[PDB]
Amino acid sequence: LGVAFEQGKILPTPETVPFRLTRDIVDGMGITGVEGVFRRCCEKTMEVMRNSQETLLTIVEVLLYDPLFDWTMNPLKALYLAQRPSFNKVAERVLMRLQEKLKGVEEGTVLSVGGQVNLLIQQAIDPKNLSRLFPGWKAWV
Amino acid sequence: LGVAFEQGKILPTPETVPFRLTRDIVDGMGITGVEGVFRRCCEKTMEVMRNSQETLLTIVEVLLYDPLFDWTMNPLKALYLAQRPSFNKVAERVLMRLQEKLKGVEEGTVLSVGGQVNLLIQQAIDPKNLSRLFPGWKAWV
Amino acid sequence: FLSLARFSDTQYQRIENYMKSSEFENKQALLKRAKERYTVKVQRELELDELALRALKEDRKRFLCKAVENYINCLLSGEEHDMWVFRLCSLWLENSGVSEVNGMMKRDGMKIPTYKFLPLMYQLAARMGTKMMGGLGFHEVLNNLISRISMDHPH
Numbered sequence: 001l002g003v004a005f006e007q008g009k010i011l012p013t014p015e016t017v018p019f020r021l022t023r024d025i026v027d028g029m030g031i032t033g034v035e036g037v038f039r040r041c042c043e044k045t046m047e048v049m050r051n052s053q054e055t056l057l058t059i060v061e062v063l064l065y066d067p068l069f070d071w072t073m074n075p076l077k078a079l080y081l082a083q084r085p086s087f088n089k090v091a092e093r094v095l096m097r098l099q100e101k102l103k104g105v106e107e108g109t110v111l112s113v114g115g116q117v118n119l120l121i122q123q124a125i126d127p128k129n130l131s132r133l134f135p136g137w138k139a140w141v
Numbered sequence: 142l143g144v145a146f147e148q149g150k151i152l153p154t155p156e157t158v159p160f161r162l163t164r165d166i167v168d169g170m171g172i173t174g175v176e177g178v179f180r181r182c183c184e185k186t187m188e189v190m191r192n193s194q195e196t197l198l199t200i201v202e203v204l205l206y207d208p209l210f211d212w213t214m215n216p217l218k219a220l221y222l223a224q225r226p227s228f229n230k231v232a233e234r235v236l237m238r239l240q241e242k243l244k245g246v247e248e249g250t251v252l253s254v255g256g257q258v259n260l261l262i263q264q265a266i267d268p269k270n271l272s273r274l275f276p277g278w279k280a281w282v
Numbered sequence: 283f284l285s286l287a288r289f290s291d292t293q294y295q296r297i298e299n300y301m302k303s304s305e306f307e308n309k310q311a312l313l314k315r316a317k318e319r320y321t322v323k324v325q326r327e328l329e330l331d332e333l334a335l336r337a338l339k340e341d342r343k344r345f346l347c348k349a350v351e352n353y354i355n356c357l358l359s360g361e362e363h364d365m366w367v368f369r370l371c372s373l374w375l376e377n378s379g380v381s382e383v384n385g386m387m388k389r390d391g392m393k394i395p396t397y398k399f400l401p402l403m404y405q406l407a408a409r410m411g412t413k414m415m416g417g418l419g420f421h422e423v424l425n426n427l428i429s430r431i432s433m434d435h436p437h
Contacts, residue, residue: 010309012327075316079323093304103251107296110244110251199369206375209408 003081005064005094007073013082013134021124024141034121042117050113053102060098064091082134144222146235148214154223154275162265165282175262183258191254194243201239205232223275284363287352291369294345297338347382349373354390357398367398375409378420388423396431403431 008015026033049056063069072090104111106119123129130139149156167174190197204210213231245252247260264270271280300306313331317324353370356363377383399406406428415421 006305009305010312012330014309073312075312078312078316089304090308093308099249108240108299196365196368199372203368203372203402203405206372207405207408 002077005071006097007071010073011078011082013132015137016129016132017124017126018120019124021121022130022139022141026125034125039117039121042121043113046113046117050102050104053099056102057095057099061095064094082136143218146212147238148212151214152219152223154273156278157270157273158265158267159261160265162262163271163280163282167266175266180258180262183262184254187254187258191243191245194240197243198236198240202236205235223277283352283356283359284366287349287356287366290345290349290352291373294342294349297342297345301338301342343380343382346373346377346380347386350377350383351386351390354386354394357394358390361398364398367394368402371399371402371405374420375405381418384418384420384423388418388426391427392430396434399427399431400435406431 021034029038030036064071072087100106104113104116106116111119133139162175170179171177205212213228241247245254245257247257252260274280310331313327317328350370350373353366353373357367357370374383374387406424409424410428411421411424413421415425
């Protein structure tokens with residue numbers, strides 16, 4: 001869990017998927033796929049996250065100001081992760097992005113829990129986003 | 142109407158009231174005061190503004206990029222208004238503030254039309270905010 | 283036409299916001315710091331980022347052209363949504379350097395009735411100029427449109 005707080009998007013090969021929802025993952029959920037248990041559980045989890053936005057934001061604020069927490073991406077880490085043969089401003093931007101996520105703001109518009117979950121599922125299962133990803137991530141898997 | 146887009150808050154004596162709702166204004170509305178016709182009409186107007194947020198934002202974008210529109214506050218105008226005996230960044234900040242107003246965001250939280258109207262009425266009729274205002278504005282009037 | 287124009291404008295606005303987003307600036311600053319074995323990967327990233335930027339710019343240009351064309355068609359196809367001439371003018375002024383947008387404006391906007399441009403006549407007039415006049419230049423097209431509006435509604 002070294003990579004977090006969307007530091008993977010800053011990588012030379014940006015990650016365009018919020019999480020891994022590849023074909024194997026959906027196939028292992030049964031015939032219903034993402035529809036059914038997965039979508040309802042995602043909605044319930046998002047509702048819980050939204051209802052506890054203040055606590056989560058406070059915890060992340062505590063993490064982001066830790067002097068020994070080296071969560072920021074550096075060129076050495078970026079090259080090590082993908083190899084082939086002001087701190088205050090960044091922290092404030094990350095906190096603002098997290099607050100927008102907790103309040104359902106994605107592209108400047110207010111989205112409900114169901115709409116946000118549907119958008120995340122669509123982004124994760126979009127083949128176009130998976131194509132841009134690094135081969136080592138094994139999007140086809 | 143020379144002063145607009147919250148340029149009055151940038152003045153040496155900032156304006157802490159969104160509009161004029163002094164004692165005379167409320168008294169002229171009848172015995173019911175702000176309650177009744179005034180509050181319902183404010184809610185209806187705010188709903189109309191919210192439903193046409195895209196058009197209003199586009200119009201304000203057209204205004205703010207007009208080379209001959211000198212809407213920004215300058216020290217000469219600030220001193221002339223209250224006398225006693227990067228442009229792109231400012232425009233973007235103003236547009237963001239207008240978008241937050243149109244979407245009901247006031248202090249980083251989503252407020253309904255009724256809640257926003259109640260907050261505006263409270264801010265306008267607050268004696269503490271009126272006390273800080275310039276005497277020439279005649280808050281007591 | 284209005285629905286397609288709105289969707290194309292939304293996509294173009296999202297792309298423009300992504301270009302101006304602080305995340306893009308942070309990524310660019312990281313690449314600049316990294317560029318200052320090591321050579322091969324530095325030039326590889328300085329080529330991949332340029333390729334991605336070119337593709338994003340091409341997508342933005344395509345979305346902008348489609349949005350402008352659909353807004354023009356919507357304006358020519360009715361009068362209920364005349365308020366969107368403000369969005370069409372905002373896109374035209376903010377993208378005056380694109381030759382395709384200027385050509386589309388010259389070919390189709392002259393068929394639009396002039397009275398739809400009356401409310402924003404102040405902003406149309408304030409953009410008059412001479413330095414970039416030509417056959418496909420923005421200034422000549424704007425001058426011709428303003429003159430035609432003035433001829434139709436001088437008052």
